[PDB]
């Protein structure tokens, strides 16, 4: 079995579909509307927004394409990719971030890139013209750090985070390490937050939705993953 072939349509959609681009504009448009609303409501502390990087601001789909072509999945040559620092900005992101900056709102890029990829990450953010592309605003993941809550909490110490942007539920508060059933129920419970405080972007290529199927164990063999993937489809029995 070649697991990477199973990614192909998801990757192809993400890389080529205008629908994908439209969803990014929709997310950033909605985020801008909600940013204005939040500023008009006012805050107790200095306003901030938080964004994930990969598949929220920066497009890493060329790496996923590489995995399809080579048959070698993530993280094969992921660090090589990060070091090239050539991911493109996703639709709407830069203009939204420049708008945010124009309103005096601080931006925090909370990303699970490794802290030792900061230089490459700054390089890529400078290349795409993302504001506040500095160590003070780019909060990467420490080795052994679980999730992002620690960085969110740090930001919330000094800022009232009025919006979160991401492609993975764990880019928002309240969705860490849950089973498929539990994270899905959590979405239902927090349904009012989406498009309000949590601005979500589509990423069918990879993420916690997949990790959750493996109980977050990617050390599973390819054969194991293949069975899990098949077993979790809900098929029409004609």
| Residues in region 16-75 near Mg ion by CB under 5 A | 52, 54-55
> Rule CB under 8 A: which of 74-93 touch a copy of itself?
77, 80-81, 84, 86, 91-92
Q: Which one of 26, 43, 112, 156 is in contact with a copy of itself (CB under 8 A)? A: 26
Name residue 58's beta-bridge partners.
54, 89
**Residue 143 or residue 236: which is nearer to a copy of itself going by CB?**
236
CB 161 within 8 A of CB 133: no
Residue 164 near which of a copy of itself, Mg ion, none (CB within 5-8 Å, type-dependent) = none
Q: What sections of 104-200 are H helices per DSSP?
A: 118-128, 149-158, 180-189
- 168: number of CA atoms within 13 Å, CB side? 24
Cα distance between residue 42 and residue 80, in whole Å = 43
CB 90 within 8 A of CB 24: yes
11 is in an annotated binding site: no
54 is in an annotated binding site: yes
Residue 236 near which of a copy of itself, Mg ion, none (CB within 5-8 Å, type-dependent) = a copy of itself
3-state secondary structure of 234: coil
Q: Would you say the C-alpha torsion 96, 81, 229, 110 has a positive or negative sign?
A: negative
Regarding 208 and contact with Mg ion (CB under 5 A), the answer is no
CB 199 within 8 A of CB 34: yes
Regarding 167 and contact with Mg ion (CB under 5 A), the answer is yes
160 is in an annotated binding site: no
Interface stretch with Mg ion, choices 63-71, 78-86, 124-132, 167-175 (CB under 5 A): 167-175
Interface stretch with Mg ion, choices 1-9, 133-141, 164-172, 221-229 (CB under 5 A): 164-172
Backbone angles phi, psi at 76, to 5 degrees: -55, 125
Regarding 223 and contact with a copy of itself (CB under 8 A), the answer is no
Q: Which one of 98, 191, 217, 218 is in contact with a copy of itself (CB under 8 A)? A: 191
Name residue 165's beta-bridge partners.
51, 199
CB 107 within 8 A of CB 132: yes
171 is in an annotated binding site: yes
Q: Which residues are annotated as a binding site for Mg(2+)?
A: 52, 54, 167, 171
Interaction site with Mg ion (CB under 5 A): 52, 54-55, 167
């Amino acid at each position: 079995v070649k697991l990477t072939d199973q990614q192909l349509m998801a990757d192809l959609w993400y890389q080529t579909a205008g629908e994908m681009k439209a969803l990014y504009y929709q997310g950033y448009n909605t985020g801008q509307l909600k940013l204005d609303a939040a500023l008009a409501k006012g805050t107790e502390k200095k306003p901030a927004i938080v964004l994930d990087l990969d598949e929220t601001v920066l497009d890493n789909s060329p790496h996923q394409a590489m995995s399809v072509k080579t048959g070698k999945g993530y993280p094969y040559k992921w660090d090589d990719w990060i070091n090239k620092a050539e991911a493109e900005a996703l639709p709407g992101s830069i203009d939204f971030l420049k708008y945010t900056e124009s309103k005096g709102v601080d931006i925090y890029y909370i990303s699970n890139r490794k802290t030792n990829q900061l230089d490459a990450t700054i390089k890529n953010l400078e290349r795409v013209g993302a504001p506040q592309a500095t160590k003070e605003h780019i909060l990467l993941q420490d080795p052994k750090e679980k999730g992002k809550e620690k960085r969110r909490e740090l930001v919330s110490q000094t800022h009232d985070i009025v919006l979160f942007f991401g492609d993975n539920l764990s880019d928002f508060t309240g969705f860490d390490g849950k089973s498929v059933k539990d994270r899905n129920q959590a979405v239902t419970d927090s349904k009012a937050q989406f498009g309000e405080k949590f601005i979500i972007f589509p990423n069918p290529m990879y993420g916690d939705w997949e990790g959750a199927l493996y109980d977050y164990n990617f050390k599973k063999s390819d054969a194991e993953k293949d069975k899990i993937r098949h077993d979790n489809l809900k098929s029409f029995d004609a």
